[PDB]
Write an enzyme that holds these catalytic residues in place. Structure first.
Site, short mmCIF file in Angstrom:
data_model
loop_
_atom_site.label_atom_id
_atom_site.label_comp_id
_atom_site.label_asym_id
_atom_site.label_seq_id
_atom_site.Cartn_x
_atom_site.Cartn_y
_atom_site.Cartn_z
N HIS B 200 87.56 -8.09 15.82
CA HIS B 200 88.00 -8.65 14.53
C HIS B 200 88.53 -10.07 14.64
CE1 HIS B 200 88.67 -4.32 12.81
NE2 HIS B 200 87.40 -4.65 12.85
N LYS B 226 78.49 2.51 2.41
CA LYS B 226 77.33 2.50 3.31
C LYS B 226 77.56 3.40 4.53
CE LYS B 226 73.79 -0.67 4.97
NZ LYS B 226 73.27 -2.06 4.94
N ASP B 227 78.73 3.28 5.17
CA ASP B 227 79.04 4.11 6.33
C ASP B 227 79.20 5.57 5.95
OD1 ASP B 227 78.84 2.01 8.06
OD2 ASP B 227 80.99 1.80 8.42
O1 AFI Z 1 82.50 0.54 10.71
C1 AFI Z 1 83.06 -0.63 10.98
C2 AFI Z 1 84.37 -0.69 11.39
C3 AFI Z 1 85.31 0.47 11.44
C4 AFI Z 1 85.41 1.22 10.12
C5 AFI Z 1 86.47 2.32 10.20
C6 AFI Z 1 86.17 3.30 11.33
C7 AFI Z 1 87.17 4.44 11.42
C8 AFI Z 1 86.99 5.46 12.34
C9 AFI Z 1 87.91 6.50 12.44
C10 AFI Z 1 89.00 6.50 11.61
CL1 AFI Z 1 90.16 7.81 11.72
C11 AFI Z 1 89.21 5.50 10.68
C12 AFI Z 1 88.29 4.48 10.59
C13 AFI Z 1 86.05 2.54 12.65
C14 AFI Z 1 84.98 1.46 12.56
C15 AFI Z 1 84.93 -1.99 11.80
O2 AFI Z 1 86.07 -2.11 12.25
C16 AFI Z 1 84.06 -3.25 11.67
O3 AFI Z 1 84.54 -4.33 11.99
C17 AFI Z 1 82.71 -3.09 11.17
C18 AFI Z 1 81.89 -4.22 11.02
C19 AFI Z 1 80.61 -4.09 10.52
C20 AFI Z 1 80.12 -2.85 10.17
C21 AFI Z 1 80.92 -1.72 10.32
C22 AFI Z 1 82.22 -1.83 10.82
#
Ligand code: AFI
Ligand code: CDL
Ligand code: PEE
Ligand code: PEE
Ligand code: PEE
Ligand code: PEE
Ligand code: HEC
Ligand code: HEC
Ligand code: HEM
Ligand code: HEM
Ligand code: HEM
Ligand code: HEM
Ligand code: AOQ
Ligand code: AOQ
Lengths: 81, 378, 239, 239, 378, 81
Positions: B200, B226-227
């Site tokens: 980040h 999307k995710d």
């Molecule tokens: O999915 C993510 C992401 C994050 C989202 C939240 C996820 C997450 C996983 C587990 C918990 Cl308990 C909470 C959040 C971890 C990955 C993250 O930091 C990015 O910087 C990113 C950049 C581009 C595309 C997708 C992402």
């Protein structure tokens, strides 16, 4: 640090948007999307496919050869007695 | 200010996944990190449950799993989920690596190095879980992997005997496998957090390989939904694998308990390992074989150093793309060779595949990059 | 190397097909009267037959037929008692050395997961049970082996275990070797994987659900992304 | 309630005093010839006596005196063999029900940690062994109990186990009840805590070290803090 | 810039324990947090080793510990260290709490609340470790603590049977104790990091209760060497307890294996618990007893709310000080009563001590604070 | 946030210091430190000690009483027969 207030410096660009509730979610699939997918397949076909074809030929050859190697050779008993 | 920005914990969450600036144009290949995290969480939960019924003793391990799958209410599906989740975990891992090789994201050095660390840790973990059932394949897998350190010239045999805790594989080794398999996933979790911290500070690369600071959008709502879509798809696949075709990836030789006096005629590890096995099989020398085995993965660390191109991504570099897909087929070939007996056709094919793997990473790609540069006149 | 078994059309092999419980009931008689002389089934108990092909009372009745060691009693000594639901099928030998001594050095395996521990599953076993024959010319067998092409090596210690009318089924079915083999094979399928029927039952439900959730969430995604998908730009420098 | 044992002057009770190994050697004979009729010592093996009071060869010799079950043999049967260093002291009874049957309902405890499992330790046991006597007026004992004031309840199933010349020590020591008791008690001390001598050995060293490190680090602290400890302030407003 | 400040990980370390501004005048009472952390680390290490030899099965637990202490090389001292480290951990914990009650540091609300959470977690952990040897005291301790939820009126008995995994305490419960005892310490670690994150946003209070921003010194070198001195002292004490007098705190009744048919005549938990036990013994009603047991600790959460004084610290408030030490003696009294049979003198004394504990926290201190205010004429 | 550059605002305070290597680490113990410890004990004695004395009296009383309660009362047998 990186924040939507000071990422870069831009001048003289105009944008226009509608709200989601004004417009359709899947507006034109068979008249626009399908041909686009077709060209998108065309533009990459010969950069990906032939390598996998070669892999397939190698796999089948090697299988056939290994399976031939396990069959009894008549000359191993017929030749000298 | 809004509460969103009133407080350190909340403001870190906000900078992470609410007001984070993400590229507008990244594709499906960027969904596999979140799926990796999901898989880690799934594994930890299902493992904590299994743990409460398993027995780390060579005289009851097997039968404890029998007990789990026959008498515990819905224990069979919990077992199924754990085992299939590991497979999904590695599928996502491989695809995640490949993206970054194709799109040039290894130029984020810290993220890349922490990724290599994570790969190593996950592999260790997976292997130390694979020996816990104490079936016939588990036992000999343990044996080989713990004899690996005999190759160290001066101190090796002593290391082997110090890891065994005795003259041979036995009860004292199984509890070590189980303690380590218990503790590693949490180290993986912490290092994942460090990994994202490093990410980040710069933000995500994108398919075109050019700077996206003119078209950043916020993470919420776009990439949140999307995710979530990606996760729904992964769950559909996982359920179909768990309930409709559970025996697809299963191995019969691990349903026979361990017998220290007999190795079975046909040996085959878990699928995500076959390729290393093939590499290990290809060198007619002990030390050289082990060295190659470890270099096969450690070689990723010098890809950033061999980069000659002016452009970052392969999107606009066709010769490069051709080589990339040839490399992927070499890896498929190693996977196929790993499944076959150690007999002459496959011996020879495996040796060629190995030499071509290293050749391609170390020589052909750098040179094609120079040719490409010359064709664009810089 | 070993001969590859052909695929038989088993009625439980469909994606949502259940096991035939009649064949289980007969296979279990085969495993009582014949196959539990040599072989153990260490991971099955009488309580497991309840609700599959027997009531609780009838499974208790099966149990009662067998003597089982128990104790110590109040004097510190062991004794024998009739069986209960919570007892495991009895072993034929006390230890594997004794098992080898009674079979000329060979050790009969435990059949509790035999169907999941062999390539081909129940296709192989059937093939093995029906498949004995006289050896080819030039082949010879050492003392106490039989010939069977579906065994790896083609020499096997186990003599042909079944033939026509080696037992009688209580439902009146004619006991030809083929029928006996098919039924015992169905029973071994059930012994290796009790969760079968309920698993398929449960698949229908949760697969329907996970299939339903895909287009809905896809619609939600498209809704949120339409803002960007129809965006229009322009460049207007003072020039 | 129970009578409080007095403190005897045991030669190992000093901070850096070791055990008397002669008394261990005699106590072990007491535990062979007398106390291993009723009692088990499940957590001690002959290999543990090596380097304490016996050579390896002599401990093998002790072992050899006892028959031990082993097997199965190649026929699947059990057999008896002479003992080895890695065998545990033998049990007197096969199970606790049999132990109760042989002692009129009472169960003799295992003496492998008896000295750490009782208030007062070896002071109590000695007190118990020497302490039997005839009961007071008004007191009566049911069938098969003795009187002993140092037992909680004062009624105890165990008859007086030792007396003068109930055994003979190989070193010629006169075997009076008191001597026997003191020696078996020393032996139980050793059986409960083998690390004793080495522990005290090791204390001397690392305590000397940790004691040394205190003033040194205190000096370093004082050095770094002298800057603030002597600081002088003043206030000088333009006024 | 120096590398000290070149990078997020390094700059967080720097803001934590190199260039952090600390009060010049804080005393020895501020050393006990670092000692707490040390103790946590010691416990995790010695536990990971023990884990590799222990058996979570009721038919071998006891004997596995016998094996550890007799056959494993120096296993006895590792056992000794684990057991004595727990005791040190609680000594430091109690002193750490008491400081903050005396010097008014509960006005840092977030730090205080996370501290209460940590206290609860540590107690759970310690208790679930105490039952693993499966001695005679361990068994009945387990029994009581798991019957506690029967007091919940509508759903309690079912909760008890769902935690047991059967009709009674048995083999399925011991593996649950062991899994939970394995996982909790790491949750404790994470929450400790959050605790310190919250602390460093404001900085440390001090003995005078007035703002110290005119006389801040850096953490390094001053408090680095000071805490190192504290650690040396703790190690001297711990070694003397481990080697010179190991049986000082030991209990003989836990050297008798478990017997489900007999509870011993005289019952006594581990020392750091006695006081709660006394409180639990003092109420002639089941539900009321349990409620009091939990309120005895939960009451710390409303101390910030009952604060009436204009001044923060007790340094300048004598009546307050008198009450503080009276409270400490009430707690000593509860500890002493916990050791004694349930007989009439001790019954009556315990009831008085309990009523005076709650009385003092809830009534007497607030009122003395008002009197004090009036004496200073504000 | 909190950093040695901007903690507070102060004017007209002067400080003086020596280096550690110029001065002694334990300069005057028995002529200054001991009396200081003595007064430091004096200033807190009566705020701490009496509560613990009361605890000690209570403890000893309760022990004595419990131990008396376990001895046989002659009137329990002498009074009526
Ligand atoms: O999915 C993510 C992401 C994050 C989202 C939240 C996820 C997450 C996983 C587990 C918990 Cl308990 C909470 C959040 C971890 C990955 C993250 O930091 C990015 O910087 C990113 C950049 C581009 C595309 C997708 C992402
Ligand atoms: C076989 C086992 C062997 C074991 C051996 C163990 C050996 C241990 C050696 C330890 C050495 C430590 C050295 C540390 C140096 C650090 C230097 C430093 O910077 O210190 C700062 C630190 C103080 O910090 P600070 O910054 O001032 O802040 C504190 C306050 O805020 C300041 O507030 P204040 O200024 O208001 O306070 C003033 C006053 C406040 O005064 C009061 O409150 C009043 C007190 C009055 C007391 C009166 C007497 C008693 C009561 C009687 C009352 C009358 C009764 C009447 C009864 C009537 C009945 C009818 O307080 C003091 O001055 C206190 C000073 C003394 C501290 C003592 C510490 C004891 C530690 C014990 C450790 C035990 C465990 C050891 C391991 C055991 C293993 C088995 O300490 C000092 O300044 C003193 C340093 C010297 C301490 C020496 C301690 C020696 C202990 C030896 C014990 C041996 C026996 C063990 C028995 C075990 C049994 C199981
Ligand atoms: C007894 C059976 C169970 C009954 C359960 C009843 C509850 C049902 C679920 C209710 C969910 C909560 C809905 C209402 C939330 C209101 C939140 C609120 O007011 O705070 C918003 C406001 C937003 O912040 P700013 O952005 O700064 O606002 C500035 C605006 N210009 O404040 C906040 O920051 C959020 C605060 C959240 C508070 C949440 C409180 C939750 C209470 C839950 C109680 C549950 C009780 C369960 C009892 C079970 C039986 C014992
Ligand atoms: C249970 C058994 C599991 C077996 C193993 C499963 C994992 C391996 C799967 C291998 C096959 C993967 C095929 C993926 C689809 C390929 C589609 C394709 O060729 O599309 C090309 C299309 C072209 O697009 P652009 O160049 O961006 O320009 C278009 C915009 N104008 O997309 C791409 O090229 C994107 C490529 C992204 C990377 C894909 C990586 C696939 C393989 C990764 C895993 C391989 C093993 C590990 C490799 C690294 C080892 C150090
Ligand atoms: C073969 C037997 C073993 C042999 C072992 C040999 C090594 C012995 C131990 C040596 C310890 C290191 C001492 C030297 C460290 C030098 C560090 C350095 O130069 O970096 C300082 C400088 C400080 O930063 P700034 O503040 O920005 O500086 C600005 C100044 N105005 O750089 C840094 O930030 C620190 C960098 C640290 C680098 C450390 C490298 C360590 C190398 C260890 C090798 C060990 C090999 C062991 C081999 C074992 C057998 C296979
Ligand atoms: C193995 C068995 C363990 C048994 C339990 C051990 C822990 C309990 C120990 C209890 C006794 C502790 C005595 C500590 C020394 C007291 C010395 C003393 O009275 O000094 C007073 C002196 C006065 O100084 P000031 O007012 O700051 O002004 C001076 C500057 N001009 O110092 C103080 O008052 C400082 C007090 C700090 C807090 C001390 C807390 C002690 C007890 C804490 C644990 C008690 C149990 C838990 C309490 C909280 C429960 C919710
Ligand atoms: C004693 C006369 C037996 C009876 C009755 C049954 N079996 Fe058996 N079996 C026996 C031996 C001595 C062996 C060892 C064979 C060897 O070569 O070592 C076996 C083996 C099997 C196997 C294993 C097949 C394999 O590929 O490993 C199976 C699947 C098997 N037997 C099945 C089986 C069944 C269904 C029986 C009842 C109809 C049965 N056996 C009876 C000895 C004896
Ligand atoms: C059979 C005749 C025995 C011999 C020989 C020895 N002991 Fe024993 N012991 C025996 C019984 C039946 C009991 C049970 C007593 C009861 O009241 O239940 C015991 C008990 C003990 C104890 C326990 C003391 C306690 O407070 O629990 C001890 C410490 C003990 N015995 C020691 C002991 C020793 C040293 C012996 C050899 C000199 C010995 N016993 C011999 C039966 C028999
Ligand atoms: C447990 C293992 C891992 C987890 C949980 C994980 C997690 C993540 C996540 C969530 C992202 C966000 C962006 C995205 O999803 O693409 C990411 C990015 C990234 N990962 Fe990892 N990862 C893991 C392993 C790896 C490995 C093995 C590598 C490389 C060998 C790696 C290298 C990278 C890189 C370079 C990025 C950023 C690339 C870009 O944004 O273009 N990671 N990771
Ligand atoms: C990255 C995380 C993890 C991975 C990749 C992983 C992988 C595996 C694998 C492959 C197996 C063997 C599967 C089989 O034999 O069918 C296994 C078994 C096991 N794992 Fe996990 N695991 C993870 C996390 C955990 C955690 C956190 C625990 C906590 C206790 C755990 C506990 C167990 C247990 C008890 C078993 C044996 C039970 C069984 O074989 O079914 N696992 N693990
Ligand atoms: C595992 C348990 C704990 C650990 C490791 C821990 C650690 C620490 C550390 C290292 C400090 C630094 C300052 C100092 O040492 O005094 C601290 C401060 C503090 N702790 Fe904790 N602590 C724990 C439990 C608690 C508990 C149980 C409470 C309260 C009930 C608490 C409340 C506080 C407060 C209020 C401060 C700051 C007070 C001040 O600076 O004046 N902590 N803690
Ligand atoms: C705050 C951290 C911890 C505390 C307070 C704690 C406390 C305790 C206590 C009091 C005991 C019983 C001592 C005895 O019976 O003599 C114990 C036993 C045990 N603990 Fe820890 N523990 C901690 C961390 C850990 C960790 C991280 C592990 C990792 C496996 C662990 C593994 C064990 C084991 C295996 C035992 C049984 C061995 C024995 O009883 O000697 N502990 N623990
Ligand atoms: O002969 C082998 C063998 O060689 C391995 C190998 C496979 C590759 C493994 C591996 C080690 C290190 C890395 Cl970074 C990756 C894979 C090590 C064990 C097995 O996994 C195995 C399992 C069961 C029976 C036999 C065997
Ligand atoms: O009777 C008890 C008993 O009552 C407790 C109690 C002590 C207090 C505990 C406690 C519970 C919750 C908290 Cl927050 C603190 C302490 C719970 C168990 C025991 O620890 C015990 C141990 C061994 C035998 C019997 C007993």
């Amino acid at each position: 640090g990186r924040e939507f207030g000071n990422l870069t410096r831009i001048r003289h660009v105009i944008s226009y948007s509608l709200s989601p509730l004004e417009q359709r979610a899947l507006p034109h699939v068979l008249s626009k999307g399908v041909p686009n997918m077709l060209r998108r397949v065309r533009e990459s076909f010969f950069r990906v496919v032939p390598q996998f074809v070669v892999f397939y030929l190698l796999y089948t050859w090697g299988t056939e050869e290994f399976e031939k190697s396990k069959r009894k050779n008549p000359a191993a008993y017929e030749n000298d007695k | 200010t809004p509460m969103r920005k009133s407080n350190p914990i909340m403001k870190m969450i906000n900078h992470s996944l609410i007001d984070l600036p993400t590229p507008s144009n990244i594709s499906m290949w960027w969904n596999f990190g979140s799926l990796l995290a999901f898989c880690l969480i799934l594994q930890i939960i299902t493992g904590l449950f299994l743990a409460m019924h398993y027995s780390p003793d060579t005289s009851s391990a097997f039968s404890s799993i029998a007990h789990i799958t026959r008498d515990v209410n819905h224990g069979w599906i919990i077992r199924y989920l754990h085992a299939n989740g590991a497979s999904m975990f590695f599928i996502c891992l491989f695809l995640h690596v490949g993206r970054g090789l194709y799109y040039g994201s290894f130029l984020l050095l810290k993220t890349w190095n922490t990724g290599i660390m994570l790969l190593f840790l996950t592999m260790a973990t997976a292997f130390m879980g694979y020996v816990l059932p104490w079936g016939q394949m588990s036992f000999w897998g343990a044996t080989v992997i713990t004899n690996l350190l005999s190759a160290i010239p001066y101190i090796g045999t002593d290391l082997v005997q110090w890891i065994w805790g005795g003259y041979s594989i036995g009860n004292p080794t199984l509890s070590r496998f189980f303690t380590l398999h218990f503790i590693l996933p949490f180290i993986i979790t912490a290092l994942t957090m460090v990994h994202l911290l490093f990410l980040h500070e710069t933000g995500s690369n994108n398919p075109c390989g050019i700077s996206s600071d003119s078209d950043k959008i916020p993470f919420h709502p776009y990439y949140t939904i999307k995710d979530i879509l990606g996760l729904v798809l992964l769950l559909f696949i996982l359920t179909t694998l768990t309930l409709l075709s559970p025996n697809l990836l299963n191995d019969p030789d691990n349903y026979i308990p361990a017998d220290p006096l007999n190795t079975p005629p046909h040996i085959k590890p878990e699928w995500y390992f076959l390729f290393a096995y093939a590499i290990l099989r290809s060198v007619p020398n002990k030390l050289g074989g082990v060295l190659a085995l470890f270099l096969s993965i450690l070689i990723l660390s010098i890809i950033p150093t061999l980069h000659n191109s002016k452009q970052q991504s392969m999107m606009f570099r066709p010769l490069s793309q051709f080589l990339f897909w040839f490399l992927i087929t070499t890896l498929l070939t190693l996977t196929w060779i790993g499944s076959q007996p150690v007999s002459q056709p496959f011996i020879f094919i495996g040796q060629l595949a190995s030499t071509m793997y290293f050749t391609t990473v170390l020589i052909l790609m750098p040179l094609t990059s120079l040719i490409e540069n010359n064709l664009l006149k810089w | 190397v070993a001969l590859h078994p052909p695929s038989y059309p088993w009625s439980h092999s469909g994606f949502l097909s259940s096991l035939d419980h009649t064949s289980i009931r007969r296979g279990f008689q085969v495993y009582k009267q014949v196959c539990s002389s040599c072989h153990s089934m260490n991971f099955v108990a009488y309580r497991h037959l309840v609700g599959v092909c027997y009531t609780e009372d009838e499974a208790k009745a099966l149990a009662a037929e067998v003597e089982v060691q128990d104790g110590p009693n109040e004097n510190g000594e062991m004794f024998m008692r009739p069986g209960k639901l919570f007892d495991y099928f009895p072993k034929p030998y006390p230890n594997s050395e004794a098992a080898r001594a009674a079979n000329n050095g060979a050790l009969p395996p435990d059949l509790s997961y035999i169907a999941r521990a062999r390539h081909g599953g129940e296709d192989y076993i059937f093939s093995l049970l029906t498949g004995y024959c006289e050896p080819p010319t030039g082949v010879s067998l050492r003392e106490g082996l039989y010939f069977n092409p579906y065994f790896p090596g083609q020499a096997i210690a186990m003599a042909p275990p079944i033939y026509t009318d080696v037992l009688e089924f209580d439902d009146g079915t004619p006991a030809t070797m083929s029928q006996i083999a098919k039924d015992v094979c169905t029973f071994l399928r059930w012994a290796s994987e009790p969760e079968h029927d309920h698993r398929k039952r449960m698949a229908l439900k949760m697969l329907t659900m996970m299939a339903l959730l895909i287009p809905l969430t896809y619609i939600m995604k498209r809704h949120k992304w339409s803002v960007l998908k129809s965006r229009k730009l322009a460049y207007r420098p003072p020039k």
